[PDB]
């Protein structure tokens, strides 16, 4: 604890019943930081918090906190000998003392979660499989994967037009930089049965919201190519092919290519089009077409073309093509609670149900997705988000927080002229009649997932066949 000869990552376990003292300095030991506890008292005093508050002036950092003997890294094997306080409230003298001999305290229990589970708001109000499914699906959510995406020639990349930070957030996301590169949009979710097009894990989206850019994304796809001069026997070269010299020329037109054989940026390209005109010298004479076509049925625009030399040093070309993906029926969307579903139908703003103040939901999800799944975090997030949007906040959905429960959120929401439980009177968009049931509606953070239907739809009728067995190809 003094940063003397023993470094911080050294584990020192005393098994008492068997008289071993096992000291470990090797690598690969997973450990975590914990607050040391005096007799029944944190060593972390207000002086440490004060110095930490001005961390940017007096260069008082974490590593001084460790050097002060206030924090300690404990490995899994040494936890067996440690008596942990979940919070300093456990250190507090009680009518019946549970332990009274604690040695360490959690900094915060929410640090048991990882990167993707630290995104979930109110994860302790969900069934745990739902938290696992979200931790999986946050990795398929679109956003801005990195700030310098304009210069990266990634094979596949999805960028959301209008990423938003969640209105209801956890205090862990401040370190995941989710606020700075968020992967979703706050959507006005109504949980309702409306026309039957959201049944069995499906959603009804607002066509008008989609027209305004709601969950619109851009898909970037990069195509490689290189002209190999491996030997005088045969050499490839980028050049606009010609019908008179090239042998394996498809019937697709090559007019979009330039002299150099490379398409130019800003050119609209449809499926089966040519972006690189490459010809290889033969042993329809003395050169055969080996051009690069678009991956079929894409219909994008050439975002940019880069030319350079590879390691060995022949020409090398990268072409990024850009395709705007507007959400549509069959695109998969998810909240942060394992509630995934495809778009069942899109209604225009006049067809959607509306509140007395003409707010239509961006998304309508079916109430039958809640009861078996027990994703109460979804409902609490919706209510907290209504409070946050009406109050001008960002809600605190950190997992284990006794200063935030459903009652106090409901009391807050009732102060803004809303039903305290997040229900509203909606009117049928088609007829304008009030719906007899008051619908639960509010802001919820939704995610657009990589799984778009246009990348999955496929059909065949007498296409190509495999060489070995003359059967249809795969994929």
């Amino acid at each position: 604890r003094q940063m003397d000869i023993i470094v911080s990552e050294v584990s020192m376990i005393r098994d008492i019943r068997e008289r071993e003292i096992r000291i470990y300095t090797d690598a690969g030991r997973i450990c975590r930081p914990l607050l040391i506890v005096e007799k029944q008292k944190l060593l972390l005093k207000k002086r440490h918090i004060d110095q930490l508050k001005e961390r940017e002036y007096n260069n008082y950092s974490w590593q001084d906190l460790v050097a002060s003997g206030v924090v300690e890294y404990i490995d899994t094997l040494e936890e067996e000998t440690v008596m942990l306080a979940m919070t300093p409230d456990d250190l507090q003298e009680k009518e019946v003392a549970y332990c009274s001999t604690y040695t360490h305290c959690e900094i915060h229990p929410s640090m048991i979660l990882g990167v993707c589970a630290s995104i979930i708001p109110f994860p302790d109000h969900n069934q745990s499989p739902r938290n696992t499914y979200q931790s999986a699906m946050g990795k398929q959510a679109m956003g801005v994967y990195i700030t310098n995406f304009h210069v990266r020639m990634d094979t596949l990349a999805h960028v959301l037009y209008y990423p938003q930070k969640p209105l209801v957030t956890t205090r862990s996301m401040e370190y995941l930089r989710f606020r700075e590169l968020p992967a979703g949009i706050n959507s006005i979710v109504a949980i309702a049965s409306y026309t039957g097009y959201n049944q069995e894990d499906s959603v009804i989206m607002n066509r008008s919201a989609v027209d305004r850019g709601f969950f619109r994304s851009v898909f970037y796809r990069s195509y490689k190519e290189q002209e190999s001069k491996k030997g005088f026997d045969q050499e490839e070269v980028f050049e606009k092919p010609t019908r008179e010299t090239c042998q394996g020329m498809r019937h697709a037109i090559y007019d979009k290519l330039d002299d150099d054989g490379l398409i130019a940026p800003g050119v609209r390209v449809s499926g089966d089009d040519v972006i690189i005109g490459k010809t290889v010298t033969l042993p329809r004479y003395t050169k055969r077409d080996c051009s690069t076509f678009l991956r079929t049925s894409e219909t994008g625009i050439v975002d940019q073309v880069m030319v350079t030399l590879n390691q060995e040093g022949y020409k090398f070309c990268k072409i990024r093509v850009r395709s705007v993906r507007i959400p549509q029926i069959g695109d998969k969307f998810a909240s942060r609670h394992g509630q995934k579903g495809t778009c069942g139908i899109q209604y225009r703003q006049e067809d959607m149900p509306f509140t007395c103040e003409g707010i239509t939901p961006d998304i309508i999800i079916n109430p039958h997705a809640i009861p078996s799944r027990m994703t109460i975090g979804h409902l609490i997030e919706c209510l907290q988000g209504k409070v946050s949007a009406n109050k001008g906040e960002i809600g605190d959905a950190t997992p284990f927080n006794d200063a935030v429960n459903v009652q106090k959120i409901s009391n807050l929401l009732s102060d803004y002229g809303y039903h305290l439980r997040g229900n509203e009177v909606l009117y049928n968009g088609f007829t304008g009649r009030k719906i007899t049931s008051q619908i639960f509606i509010g802001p919820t953070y939704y995610q657009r997932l990589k799984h778009m239907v246009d990348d999955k739809i496929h059909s065949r009728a007498r296409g190509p066949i495999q060489i070995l067995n003359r059967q249809p190809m795969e994929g």
Binding site: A85, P109, S202, P367, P371, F440
Partner: protein, 404 residues
């Protein structure tokens, strides 16, 4: 076309469909035919095969079409029934106090394919003409079928006392000459079970009439649910303070009884029962204290519910959920088990480093005394994650061995 979903488990996983060309780029399915395919719409994909000859087309038309597939030979009962929104909404629609106006009735009759064009005489003519939901479902019901069922909330002591044939709760479904004489329809009447209205329709009427029956229930009920609406929110997960404080009193019994048992075991006041070691008897005795607690708190939460509650609405209809789900959302999540036992001592005689050694109390071994609305404590959260991981492993490991 043959429409198929993988894994192709039984003969209803590949059925014949007639093609309907529609704008966007997905395969659009009816909602009753999702249960045979085990299909939902969270990104599922399905395969379409087009027979290429009149021979095979006739074969699929006469053998494999969906209406011919309504009743499965596996369990002599329908394989597809009425499903989520239509089932919740038909439960709400056939309640005794559903009265439809003239315009609403005409709007619903627009969606009956098998309608003779005759508006039925309203059940109430004065002071206002009002039709009932049973009166319109009677028009949906085909042929002249006869059926007796009981709604899921039917009390078991009602068939004995008076009011057998005039049910106070509008349970005891009676369809007679194709008219819903009485009762609230639900999973027991329109689901996949044996003797239901859909089964009896398939047996008495053909597969064509039953196809139309399915479609008509869905269209009429969905267009009525456009008026009625169905939702779920926080208000359905709340209970009154009486109920909360009953549940807390029950849990504090349960813990304080488990403490009783723990001292008896500690003082050797506890003797084994036949067929079990002392450890196993203590574990039984604690688990049966805590299951009594979980059942009692669940009962309290159930009785606290109103008939405006949407959790209850979906559980009575049988559309989705169960009473145990309501108990976990409102009352208490309960004991988390790993391999059928309480949470194991993965540390030295400890489930976590936050407990003292040799702590067999309910908290320590994975009893979640909170609801999902209350929120789990960090230890409860970890133990619940352990139990859910057990479920995920089971789901991911049974498939290979069952498929083999």
């Amino acid at each position: 076309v043959i429409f198929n979903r993988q894994p192709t488990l039984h003969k209803m996983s590949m059925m014949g469909h007639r093609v309907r060309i529609l704008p966007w780029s997905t395969f659009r399915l009816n909602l009753s035919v999702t249960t045979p395919y085990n299909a939902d719409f969270d990104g599922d994909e399905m395969n379409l095969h087009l027979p290429q000859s009149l021979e095979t087309r006739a074969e699929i038309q006469e053998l494999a079409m969906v209406p011919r597939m309504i009743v499965t030979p596996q369990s002599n009962r329908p394989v597809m029934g009425i499903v989520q929104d239509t089932l919740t909404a038909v439960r709400k629609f056939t309640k005794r106090d559903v009265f439809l106006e003239r315009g609403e009735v005409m709007n619903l009759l627009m969606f009956l394919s098998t309608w003779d064009g005759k508006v039925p005489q309203p059940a109430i003519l004065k002071p206002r003409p009002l039709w009932t939901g049973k009166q319109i479902f009677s028009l949906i019901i085909p042929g002249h079928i006869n059926c007796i069922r009981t709604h899921s909330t039917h009390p078991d002591d009602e068939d004995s006392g008076p009011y057998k044939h005039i049910s106070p709760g509008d349970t005891k479904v009676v369809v007679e000459n194709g008219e819903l004489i009485m009762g609230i329809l639900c999973k027991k009447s329109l689901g996949t079970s044996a003797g239901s209205l859909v089964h009896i329709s398939y047996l008495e009427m053909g597969h064509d009439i039953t196809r139309l029956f399915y479609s008509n229930i869905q269209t009429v009920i969905n267009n009525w649910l456009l008026i009625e609406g169905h939702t779920i929110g926080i208000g359905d997960s709340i209970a009154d303070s009486k109920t909360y404080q009953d549940i807390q009193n029950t849990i504090k019994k349960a813990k304080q009884d488990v403490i009783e048992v723990i001292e008896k075991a500690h003082n050797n006041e506890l003797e084994p029962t036949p067929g079990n070691t002392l450890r196993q008897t203590f574990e039984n005795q604690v688990n049966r204290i805590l299951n009594d607690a979980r059942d009692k708190t669940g009962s309290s939460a159930q009785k606290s519910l109103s008939e405006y509650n949407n959790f209850k609405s979906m559980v009575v209809s049988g559309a989705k959920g169960s009473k145990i789900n309501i108990s976990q959302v409102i009352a208490v999540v309960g004991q988390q088990n790993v391999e059928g036992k309480r949470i194991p001592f993965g540390f030295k005689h400890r489930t976590l480093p936050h407990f003292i050694k040799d702590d067999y109390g309910p908290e320590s071994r994975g009893f979640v005394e909170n609801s999902y609305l209350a929120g789990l404590t960090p230890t409860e959260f970890f133990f619940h994650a352990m139990g859910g991981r057990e479920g995920l492993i089971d789901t991911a490991v049974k498939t290979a061995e069952t498929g083999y």
